[PDB]
Amino acid sequence: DLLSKFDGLIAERQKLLDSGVTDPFAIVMEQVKSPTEAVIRGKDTILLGTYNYMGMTFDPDVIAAGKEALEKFGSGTCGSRMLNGTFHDHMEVEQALRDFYGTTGAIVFSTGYMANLGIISTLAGKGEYVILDADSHASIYDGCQQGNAEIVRFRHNSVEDLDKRLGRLPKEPAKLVVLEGVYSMLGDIAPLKEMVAVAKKHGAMVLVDEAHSMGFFGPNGRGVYEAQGLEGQIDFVVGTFSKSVGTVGGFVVSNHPKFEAVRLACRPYIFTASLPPSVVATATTSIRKLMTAHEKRERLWSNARALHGGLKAMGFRLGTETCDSAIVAVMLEDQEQAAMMWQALLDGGLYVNMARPPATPAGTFLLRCSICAEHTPAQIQTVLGMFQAAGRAVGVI
Amino acid sequence: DLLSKFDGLIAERQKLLDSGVTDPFAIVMEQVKSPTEAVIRGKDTILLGTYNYMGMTFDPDVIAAGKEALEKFGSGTCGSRMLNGTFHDHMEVEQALRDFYGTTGAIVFSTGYMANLGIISTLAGKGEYVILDADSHASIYDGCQQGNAEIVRFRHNSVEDLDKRLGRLPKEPAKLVVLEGVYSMLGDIAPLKEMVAVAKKHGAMVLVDEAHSMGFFGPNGRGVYEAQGLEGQIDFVVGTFSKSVGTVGGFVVSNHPKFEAVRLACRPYIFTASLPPSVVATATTSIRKLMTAHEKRERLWSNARALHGGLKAMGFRLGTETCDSAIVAVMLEDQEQAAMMWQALLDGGLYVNMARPPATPAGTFLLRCSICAEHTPAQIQTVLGMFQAAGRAVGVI
Ligand SMILES: *Cc1c(COP(=O)(O)O)cnc(C)c1O
Ligand SMILES: *Cc1c(COP(=O)(O)O)cnc(C)c1O
């Protein structure tokens, strides 16, 4: 039947579980005390595998805004943004994004996945081009699949291939170059300055995703593009509420005069309910605090540098030479080594994000650590000691 | 540039606004007192254009569950369901759905749109078939577009065309027939008993969307399929948290033994954050109350019958001869008549959902009313008096 196609995946899963490893796709956070602490399988555990970069999910102002919105506006809107679903707090969250990015336009979607799906498929039509990194987020590829444009993949992280591929396209048709500021798999940074220069040389519009940089890159926390001096040069910035902001939702911001007309045509905007009042209320409060959360930014980067430096010095192969983001990826030689490390860490009281094929390319096996502004120095050292113990026991170092 | 394609839509919008009508796509609920009352443009307004069918968004148990989850688990998970994003309340909401539908399997997505997008594109692959009503929800079509299957549209509401089109397909390949229990545009009901019999005659699996029926059709509130005696015959049921349940989210339930393996392969499940703790907590509480909300069900149907009967008797052309759902669609002769009615109702203190092309087919112009369990008899009569006044002033009756 229709599910027979999953027999291989089912057998692969059972093979993994035959090794005695905890099912990595069924972890449950039974309790979550803070941004950095949970209870998993009854064990107190340090969280080092979340995108709660700025610790906003337990910020007292954020929590209070959510509770107040539940009380005042109820649990949901029961309507789309095109009909009855735009409440006070939806207007507030779009304004918060305008203020955060310094843009005249802001369109909020129910998820980041849907923002990418919708904006890519709506902006570029038949006879037009979407140009993207080969290893772009699934939602960006799904946006391409949803639309009718010509898709132009370029070699991962290659300014040269972007330039050459763009240069061979016909000059007249409109073009969208889609870039990510931070590459989430290894936690390295895109050469946006150089790539945007190339895009503009070829007359393309540019969309940059700043999901993994929000609140901690650039003077205003706007992202890698801001840090690299590209303010005013980026046509569209896409992002999410599910990482630094600490809830769910997606968005696109722009200064283009016709931008908010996208609402009239964008299927993933139109054909879904708007977000719950409490979600857009917590997002508004969080976004506004993220404009100036300097103490948190400082702690986040201090923690990232300490973890990155410590793991590198201990003998782990890292995805990056220098600490360039809040993701630190440990690279292992094979799937077994990654699973054994991950299990030892878990059993010892530490959660990190394992990544193996097909999540990663064949031959790449990772423990992806992500830092929080609210990790303490003691926690980061506890983590390093845990990696030392696990690495020695498993034979990685 | 990329936005020049919207010049026509922008001109169309300005033409509409030149008539002096309030922008129907920019309505803001400044305050929302209850499921049935809001403040719009500073005016106290009865809401008669929401999908809050069972009034659950202000249920005190629902609200309390959301507040408690914010306090205990924070504003968001900052991770996917495949990694760090499955908290206690995510497991709770999936179990609530199992209990609600009497199924062994339940997979929750971040929106109903994404549940349809994902389940359709993941279940049916190359060489297989998705068979759907010509006027299916956008998300169902988008699921088809996202996948690699052969798409087979059948004439709207035609058991005969479903049968004939299915019969011409090759017998061996697996097939998914996708049906909706309630047709949302006019509020009529699908002939599921007959269509499912046809699907099974041709050996197809069946997916039914019960978004517009949840909690008020069938003995257990499971939907039109349950009301029509099809318990145990439906392979997959898809739904949403954004209507009766009163928050955001999507889901698919099934008794198929391999079903939850869908999680391993479904892109809109994998590549997005899980829902906020408060969202899955309010949904759990709401879903469980909806299993036995008999007083509300009774009120909802009483209100629907009173509104449907009243509008019909007053001389409005309705989308349905009998009151078959909680949607009552008033059909107007042209766009101007619909807009004038909608504006008169709005100015007089009533919000309904206008629908004009391209939301509707060319030549169809609607005021779509939707009933709530928490509308009072006085409110329903107030609404009827408002329709009488508006209809007389505009010249519709
Ligand atoms: C996180 C992320 C997304 C998805 O965001 P959600 O809001 O979790 O759906 C999409 N694209 C990129 C580049 C991301 O980093
Ligand atoms: C409401 C509805 C959807 C979308 O649900 P959301 O949760 O609002 O995204 C999808 N399909 C059908 C048939 C619906 O009725």
Curated annotation (Swiss-Prot), chains A, B:
Query: What residues bear N6-(pyridoxal phosphate)lysine in this entry?
Result: K243
- Binding sites annotated in the UniProt record for pyridoxal 5'-phosphate: G112, Y113, H212, T240, S242
Changing R356N: what effect? 60-fold decrease in catalytic efficiency for L-serine
Q: What GO molecular function terms would the record report?
A: acyltransferase activity; pyridoxal phosphate binding
UniProt keyword list: Acyltransferase, Cytoplasm, Lipid metabolism, Pyridoxal phosphate, Transferase
According to the UniProt record, activity depends on pH as follows:
Optimum pH is 7.5 to 8.0.
- EC top class named in words: transferase
Return the Gene3D superfamilies for the record.
Aspartate Aminotransferase, domain 1, Type I PLP-dependent aspartate aminotransferase-like (Major domain)
* Record-linked InterPro entries: Aminotrans_II_pyridoxalP_BS, Aminotransferase_I/II_large, AON_synthase_class-II, PyrdxlP-dep_Trfase, PyrdxlP-dep_Trfase_major, PyrdxlP-dep_Trfase_small
Pfam families, from UniProt?
Answer: Aminotran_1_2 (PF00155)
Superkingdom of the source species: Bacteria
One CC-aspect GO term:
membrane
Please give the catalytic activity noted in the UniProt record.
L-serine + hexadecanoyl-CoA + H(+) = 3-oxosphinganine + CO2 + CoA
Pathway-wise, it operates in:
Lipid metabolism; sphingolipid metabolism
* GO BP of this protein: biosynthetic process; sphingolipid metabolic process
Listed transmembrane segments: none
> Where in the cell?
Cytoplasm
Q: Which cofactor does it need?
A: pyridoxal 5'-phosphate
Activity control: Not inhibited by relatively high concentrations of palmitoyl-CoA. Inhibited by both D-cycloserine (DCS) and L-cycloserine (LCS), which inactivate SPT by transamination to form a free pyridoxamine 5'-phosphate (PMP) and beta-aminooxyacetaldehyde that remain bound at the active site. Inhibition is reversed by incubation with excess pyridoxal phosphate. Inhibited by the fungal natural product myriocin, which acts as a competitive inhibitor for both L-serine and palmitoyl-CoA substrates.
EC assignment: 2.3.1.50
Membership in a protein family: Belongs to the class-II pyridoxal-phosphate-dependent aminotransferase family.
SUBUNIT field: Homodimer.
This protein is called Serine palmitoyltransferase
Instruction: Tell me the organism.
Output: Sphingomonas paucimobilis (Pseudomonas paucimobilis)
What gene is this protein a product of?
spt
